[PDB]
PDB file of all heavy atoms in Angstrom:
ATOM      1  N   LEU O   1     124.979   6.199  90.323  1.00 28.43           N
ATOM      2  CA  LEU O   1     125.538   6.663  91.538  1.00 28.43           C
ATOM      3  C   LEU O   1     127.009   6.973  91.454  1.00 28.43           C
ATOM      4  O   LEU O   1     127.768   6.162  90.951  1.00 28.43           O
ATOM      5  CB  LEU O   1     125.230   5.679  92.672  1.00 28.43           C
ATOM      6  CG  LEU O   1     123.756   5.400  92.714  1.00 28.43           C
ATOM      7  CD1 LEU O   1     123.375   4.485  93.841  1.00 28.43           C
ATOM      8  CD2 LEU O   1     122.912   6.652  92.782  1.00 28.43           C
ATOM      9  N   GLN O   2     127.392   8.122  91.978  1.00 30.66           N
ATOM     10  CA  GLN O   2     128.762   8.541  92.004  1.00 30.66           C
ATOM     11  C   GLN O   2     129.213   8.826  93.483  1.00 30.66           C
ATOM     12  O   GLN O   2     128.657   9.736  94.116  1.00 30.66           O
ATOM     13  CB  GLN O   2     128.906   9.787  91.145  1.00 30.66           C
ATOM     14  CG  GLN O   2     130.277  10.482  91.268  1.00 30.66           C
ATOM     15  CD  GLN O   2     130.253  11.895  90.746  1.00 30.66           C
ATOM     16  OE1 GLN O   2     129.547  12.211  89.751  1.00 30.66           O
ATOM     17  NE2 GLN O   2     131.030  12.759  91.356  1.00 30.66           N
ATOM     18  N   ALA O   3     130.144   7.984  93.908  1.00 32.64           N
ATOM     19  CA  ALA O   3     130.724   8.128  95.218  1.00 32.64           C
ATOM     20  C   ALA O   3     132.102   8.789  95.189  1.00 32.64           C
ATOM     21  O   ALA O   3     132.952   8.424  94.274  1.00 32.64           O
ATOM     22  CB  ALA O   3     130.822   6.770  95.921  1.00 32.64           C
ATOM     23  N   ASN O   4     132.354   9.642  96.107  1.00 29.89           N
ATOM     24  CA  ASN O   4     133.648  10.181  96.346  1.00 29.89           C
ATOM     25  C   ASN O   4     134.340  10.615  95.071  1.00 29.89           C
ATOM     26  O   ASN O   4     135.546  10.452  94.962  1.00 29.89           O
ATOM     27  CB  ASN O   4     134.542   9.171  97.118  1.00 29.89           C
ATOM     28  CG  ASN O   4     135.530   9.846  97.964  1.00 29.89           C
ATOM     29  OD1 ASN O   4     136.710   9.425  98.051  1.00 29.89           O
ATOM     30  ND2 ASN O   4     135.226  10.972  98.495  1.00 29.89           N
ATOM     31  N   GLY O   5     133.583  11.142  94.195  1.00 26.68           N
ATOM     32  CA  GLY O   5     134.165  11.649  92.947  1.00 26.68           C
ATOM     33  C   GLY O   5     134.455  10.620  91.895  1.00 26.68           C
ATOM     34  O   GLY O   5     134.902  10.943  90.782  1.00 26.68           O
ATOM     35  N   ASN O   6     134.298   9.318  92.239  1.00 26.65           N
ATOM     36  CA  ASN O   6     134.682   8.331  91.247  1.00 26.65           C
ATOM     37  C   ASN O   6     133.693   8.364  90.103  1.00 26.65           C
ATOM     38  O   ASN O   6     132.682   9.062  90.232  1.00 26.65           O
ATOM     39  CB  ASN O   6     134.748   6.975  91.864  1.00 26.65           C
ATOM     40  CG  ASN O   6     135.751   6.951  92.964  1.00 26.65           C
ATOM     41  OD1 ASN O   6     136.926   7.267  92.803  1.00 26.65           O
ATOM     42  ND2 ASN O   6     135.273   6.635  94.153  1.00 26.65           N
ATOM     43  N   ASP O   7     133.975   7.640  89.071  1.00 28.50           N
ATOM     44  CA  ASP O   7     133.061   7.417  87.981  1.00 28.50           C
ATOM     45  C   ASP O   7     131.799   6.819  88.556  1.00 28.50           C
ATOM     46  O   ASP O   7     131.856   5.993  89.420  1.00 28.50           O
ATOM     47  CB  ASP O   7     133.656   6.442  86.960  1.00 28.50           C
ATOM     48  CG  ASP O   7     134.818   6.994  86.204  1.00 28.50           C
ATOM     49  OD1 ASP O   7     134.893   8.283  86.153  1.00 28.50           O
ATOM     50  OD2 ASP O   7     135.607   6.219  85.662  1.00 28.50           O
ATOM     51  N   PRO O   8     130.637   7.280  88.056  1.00 25.20           N
ATOM     52  CA  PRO O   8     129.327   6.811  88.493  1.00 25.20           C
ATOM     53  C   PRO O   8     129.033   5.385  88.055  1.00 25.20           C
ATOM     54  O   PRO O   8     129.563   4.908  87.018  1.00 25.20           O
ATOM     55  CB  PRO O   8     128.316   7.758  87.807  1.00 25.20           C
ATOM     56  CG  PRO O   8     129.069   8.147  86.491  1.00 25.20           C
ATOM     57  CD  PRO O   8     130.544   8.198  86.879  1.00 25.20           C
ATOM     58  N   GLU O   9     128.291   4.594  88.883  1.00 19.66           N
ATOM     59  CA  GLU O   9     127.933   3.235  88.510  1.00 19.66           C
ATOM     60  C   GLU O   9     126.421   3.044  88.422  1.00 19.66           C
ATOM     61  O   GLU O   9     125.651   3.605  89.159  1.00 19.66           O
ATOM     62  CB  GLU O   9     128.479   2.274  89.580  1.00 19.66           C
ATOM     63  CG  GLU O   9     129.962   2.311  89.737  1.00 19.66           C
ATOM     64  CD  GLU O   9     130.415   1.440  90.890  1.00 19.66           C
ATOM     65  OE1 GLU O   9     129.878   0.314  91.016  1.00 19.66           O
ATOM     66  OE2 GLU O   9     131.325   1.873  91.608  1.00 19.66           O
ATOM     67  N   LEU O  10     126.013   2.087  87.535  1.00 23.09           N
ATOM     68  CA  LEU O  10     124.592   1.709  87.380  1.00 23.09           C
ATOM     69  C   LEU O  10     124.068   0.749  88.487  1.00 23.09           C
ATOM     70  O   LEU O  10     124.871  -0.067  89.001  1.00 23.09           O
ATOM     71  CB  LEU O  10     124.332   1.141  86.026  1.00 23.09           C
ATOM     72  CG  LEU O  10     124.083   2.115  84.853  1.00 23.09           C
ATOM     73  CD1 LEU O  10     123.754   1.391  83.545  1.00 23.09           C
ATOM     74  CD2 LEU O  10     122.936   3.058  85.235  1.00 23.09           C
ATOM     75  N   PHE O  11     122.791   0.856  88.872  1.00 20.34           N
ATOM     76  CA  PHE O  11     122.170  -0.080  89.705  1.00 20.34           C
ATOM     77  C   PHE O  11     120.659  -0.057  89.407  1.00 20.34           C
ATOM     78  O   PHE O  11     120.100   0.994  89.323  1.00 20.34           O
ATOM     79  CB  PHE O  11     122.290   0.310  91.170  1.00 20.34           C
ATOM     80  CG  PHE O  11     123.746   0.429  91.683  1.00 20.34           C
ATOM     81  CD1 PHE O  11     124.363   1.622  91.638  1.00 20.34           C
ATOM     82  CD2 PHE O  11     124.361  -0.671  92.216  1.00 20.34           C
ATOM     83  CE1 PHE O  11     125.664   1.778  92.141  1.00 20.34           C
ATOM     84  CE2 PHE O  11     125.677  -0.565  92.746  1.00 20.34           C
ATOM     85  CZ  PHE O  11     126.338   0.640  92.680  1.00 20.34           C
ATOM     86  N   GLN O  12     120.020  -1.242  89.325  1.00 23.18           N
ATOM     87  CA  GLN O  12     118.562  -1.305  89.221  1.00 23.18           C
ATOM     88  C   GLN O  12     117.893  -1.404  90.623  1.00 23.18           C
ATOM     89  O   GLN O  12     118.071  -2.255  91.414  1.00 23.18           O
ATOM     90  CB  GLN O  12     118.199  -2.574  88.399  1.00 23.18           C
ATOM     91  CG  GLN O  12     116.724  -2.453  87.922  1.00 23.18           C
ATOM     92  CD  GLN O  12     116.535  -1.781  86.489  1.00 23.18           C
ATOM     93  OE1 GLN O  12     117.120  -2.309  85.522  1.00 23.18           O
ATOM     94  NE2 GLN O  12     115.826  -0.636  86.456  1.00 23.18           N
ATOM     95  N   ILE O  13     117.012  -0.412  90.901  1.00 23.60           N
ATOM     96  CA  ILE O  13     116.227  -0.503  92.162  1.00 23.60           C
ATOM     97  C   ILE O  13     115.364  -1.733  92.144  1.00 23.60           C
ATOM     98  O   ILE O  13     114.602  -1.978  91.186  1.00 23.60           O
ATOM     99  CB  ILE O  13     115.286   0.666  92.272  1.00 23.60           C
ATOM    100  CG1 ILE O  13     116.098   1.989  92.247  1.00 23.60           C
ATOM    101  CG2 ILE O  13     114.417   0.534  93.515  1.00 23.60           C
ATOM    102  CD1 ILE O  13     115.213   3.138  91.925  1.00 23.60           C
ATOM    103  N   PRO O  14     115.454  -2.530  93.231  1.00 22.67           N
ATOM    104  CA  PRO O  14     114.609  -3.740  93.177  1.00 22.67           C
ATOM    105  C   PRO O  14     113.201  -3.363  92.674  1.00 22.67           C
ATOM    106  O   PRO O  14     112.507  -2.510  93.245  1.00 22.67           O
ATOM    107  CB  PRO O  14     114.627  -4.176  94.654  1.00 22.67           C
ATOM    108  CG  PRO O  14     115.852  -3.627  95.239  1.00 22.67           C
ATOM    109  CD  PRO O  14     116.253  -2.415  94.446  1.00 22.67           C
ATOM    110  N   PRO O  15     112.770  -3.992  91.611  1.00 22.79           N
ATOM    111  CA  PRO O  15     111.452  -3.782  91.122  1.00 22.79           C
ATOM    112  C   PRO O  15     110.330  -3.737  92.200  1.00 22.79           C
ATOM    113  O   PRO O  15     109.398  -2.937  92.165  1.00 22.79           O
ATOM    114  CB  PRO O  15     111.234  -4.937  90.122  1.00 22.79           C
ATOM    115  CG  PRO O  15     112.656  -5.287  89.680  1.00 22.79           C
ATOM    116  CD  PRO O  15     113.626  -4.704  90.635  1.00 22.79           C
ATOM    117  N   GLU O  16     110.521  -4.553  93.189  1.00 26.50           N
ATOM    118  CA  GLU O  16     109.484  -4.630  94.239  1.00 26.50           C
ATOM    119  C   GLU O  16     109.577  -3.402  95.151  1.00 26.50           C
ATOM    120  O   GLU O  16     108.719  -3.198  96.004  1.00 26.50           O
ATOM    121  CB  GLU O  16     109.620  -5.975  95.049  1.00 26.50           C
ATOM    122  CG  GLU O  16     110.930  -6.226  95.890  1.00 26.50           C
ATOM    123  CD  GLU O  16     112.009  -6.983  95.104  1.00 26.50           C
ATOM    124  OE1 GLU O  16     112.016  -6.771  93.885  1.00 26.50           O
ATOM    125  OE2 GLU O  16     112.909  -7.683  95.691  1.00 26.50           O
ATOM    126  N   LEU O  17     110.621  -2.567  94.986  1.00 27.81           N
ATOM    127  CA  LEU O  17     110.667  -1.388  95.807  1.00 27.81           C
ATOM    128  C   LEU O  17     110.028  -0.138  95.211  1.00 27.81           C
ATOM    129  O   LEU O  17     109.742   0.792  95.893  1.00 27.81           O
ATOM    130  CB  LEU O  17     112.047  -1.086  96.350  1.00 27.81           C
ATOM    131  CG  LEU O  17     112.842  -2.156  97.143  1.00 27.81           C
ATOM    132  CD1 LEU O  17     114.044  -1.465  97.702  1.00 27.81           C
ATOM    133  CD2 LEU O  17     111.962  -2.634  98.237  1.00 27.81           C
ATOM    134  N   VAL O  18     109.693  -0.279  93.919  1.00 30.38           N
ATOM    135  CA  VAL O  18     109.080   0.793  93.128  1.00 30.38           C
ATOM    136  C   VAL O  18     107.555   0.632  93.044  1.00 30.38           C
ATOM    137  O   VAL O  18     107.060  -0.093  92.194  1.00 30.38           O
ATOM    138  CB  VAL O  18     109.527   0.815  91.707  1.00 30.38           C
ATOM    139  CG1 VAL O  18     108.927   1.937  90.946  1.00 30.38           C
ATOM    140  CG2 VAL O  18     111.128   0.845  91.691  1.00 30.38           C
ATOM    141  N   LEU O  19     106.830   1.227  93.961  1.00 29.55           N
ATOM    142  CA  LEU O  19     105.406   1.198  93.956  1.00 29.55           C
ATOM    143  C   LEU O  19     104.809   2.126  92.810  1.00 29.55           C
ATOM    144  O   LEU O  19     105.162   3.234  92.695  1.00 29.55           O
ATOM    145  CB  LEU O  19     104.891   1.792  95.307  1.00 29.55           C
ATOM    146  CG  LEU O  19     103.389   2.112  95.430  1.00 29.55           C
ATOM    147  CD1 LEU O  19     102.662   0.847  94.990  1.00 29.55           C
ATOM    148  CD2 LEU O  19     103.154   2.404  96.882  1.00 29.55           C
ATOM    149  N   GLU O  20     103.985   1.529  91.957  1.00 26.32           N
ATOM    150  CA  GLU O  20     103.444   2.190  90.770  1.00 26.32           C
ATOM    151  C   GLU O  20     101.951   2.039  90.767  1.00 26.32           C
ATOM    152  O   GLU O  20     101.457   1.087  91.350  1.00 26.32           O
ATOM    153  CB  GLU O  20     104.003   1.551  89.527  1.00 26.32           C
ATOM    154  CG  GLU O  20     105.498   1.909  89.264  1.00 26.32           C
ATOM    155  CD  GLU O  20     106.038   1.259  87.983  1.00 26.32           C
ATOM    156  OE1 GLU O  20     106.088   0.004  87.870  1.00 26.32           O
ATOM    157  OE2 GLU O  20     106.430   1.990  87.083  1.00 26.32           O
ATOM    158  N   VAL O  21     101.273   3.048  90.287  1.00 24.49           N
ATOM    159  CA  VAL O  21      99.775   3.053  90.164  1.00 24.49           C
ATOM    160  C   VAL O  21      99.312   3.007  88.723  1.00 24.49           C
ATOM    161  O   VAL O  21      99.703   3.816  87.926  1.00 24.49           O
ATOM    162  CB  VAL O  21      99.173   4.293  90.813  1.00 24.49           C
ATOM    163  CG1 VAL O  21      97.640   4.253  90.624  1.00 24.49           C
ATOM    164  CG2 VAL O  21      99.548   4.431  92.267  1.00 24.49           C
ATOM    165  N   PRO O  22      98.479   1.988  88.372  1.00 25.96           N
ATOM    166  CA  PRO O  22      97.944   2.042  87.020  1.00 25.96           C
ATOM    167  C   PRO O  22      96.834   3.124  87.027  1.00 25.96           C
ATOM    168  O   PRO O  22      96.201   3.371  88.004  1.00 25.96           O
ATOM    169  CB  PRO O  22      97.271   0.628  86.895  1.00 25.96           C
ATOM    170  CG  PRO O  22      97.084   0.151  88.280  1.00 25.96           C
ATOM    171  CD  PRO O  22      98.104   0.758  89.137  1.00 25.96           C
ATOM    172  N   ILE O  23      96.787   3.820  85.838  1.00 27.87           N
ATOM    173  CA  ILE O  23      95.851   4.919  85.779  1.00 27.87           C
ATOM    174  C   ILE O  23      94.523   4.642  85.070  1.00 27.87           C
ATOM    175  O   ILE O  23      94.401   4.438  83.852  1.00 27.87           O
ATOM    176  CB  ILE O  23      96.549   6.266  85.253  1.00 27.87           C
ATOM    177  CG1 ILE O  23      97.872   6.412  85.976  1.00 27.87           C
ATOM    178  CG2 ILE O  23      95.694   7.485  85.417  1.00 27.87           C
ATOM    179  CD1 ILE O  23      97.781   6.970  87.422  1.00 27.87           C
ATOM    180  N   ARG O  24      93.448   4.579  85.940  1.00 27.96           N
ATOM    181  CA  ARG O  24      92.089   4.473  85.490  1.00 27.96           C
ATOM    182  C   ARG O  24      91.158   5.667  85.939  1.00 27.96           C
ATOM    183  O   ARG O  24      91.505   6.474  86.834  1.00 27.96           O
ATOM    184  CB  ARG O  24      91.542   3.116  85.906  1.00 27.96           C
ATOM    185  CG  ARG O  24      91.528   2.840  87.415  1.00 27.96           C
ATOM    186  CD  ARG O  24      92.856   2.287  87.922  1.00 27.96           C
ATOM    187  NE  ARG O  24      92.702   1.836  89.361  1.00 27.96           N
ATOM    188  CZ  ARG O  24      93.653   1.665  90.222  1.00 27.96           C
ATOM    189  NH1 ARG O  24      94.996   1.869  90.021  1.00 27.96           N
ATOM    190  NH2 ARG O  24      93.244   1.232  91.443  1.00 27.96           N
ATOM    191  N   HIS O  25      90.020   5.727  85.351  1.00 26.49           N
ATOM    192  CA  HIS O  25      89.055   6.808  85.594  1.00 26.49           C
ATOM    193  C   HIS O  25      87.797   6.255  86.211  1.00 26.49           C
ATOM    194  O   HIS O  25      87.335   5.204  85.808  1.00 26.49           O
ATOM    195  CB  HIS O  25      88.746   7.549  84.287  1.00 26.49           C
ATOM    196  CG  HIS O  25      88.100   8.856  84.514  1.00 26.49           C
ATOM    197  ND1 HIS O  25      86.753   8.963  84.920  1.00 26.49           N
ATOM    198  CD2 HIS O  25      88.551  10.147  84.283  1.00 26.49           C
ATOM    199  CE1 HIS O  25      86.447  10.232  84.950  1.00 26.49           C
ATOM    200  NE2 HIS O  25      87.482  10.986  84.596  1.00 26.49           N
TER     201      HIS O  25
END
């Protein structure tokens, strides 16, 4: 993320906020 032109910073999205689907047939 880059605010107000400053150098961008890293951040990890809370794992629990990333909904993922395992792929089966």
Side-chain angles (χ1 to χ4, degrees):
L1 305 182
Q2 170 195 327
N4 207 220
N6 301 303
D7 289 341
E9 303 175 39
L10 276 182
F11 300 93
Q12 196 92 61
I13 300 161
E16 66 270 26
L17 301 193
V18 184
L19 171 52
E20 287 181 297
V21 179
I23 313 288
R24 61 274 190 201
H25 195 289

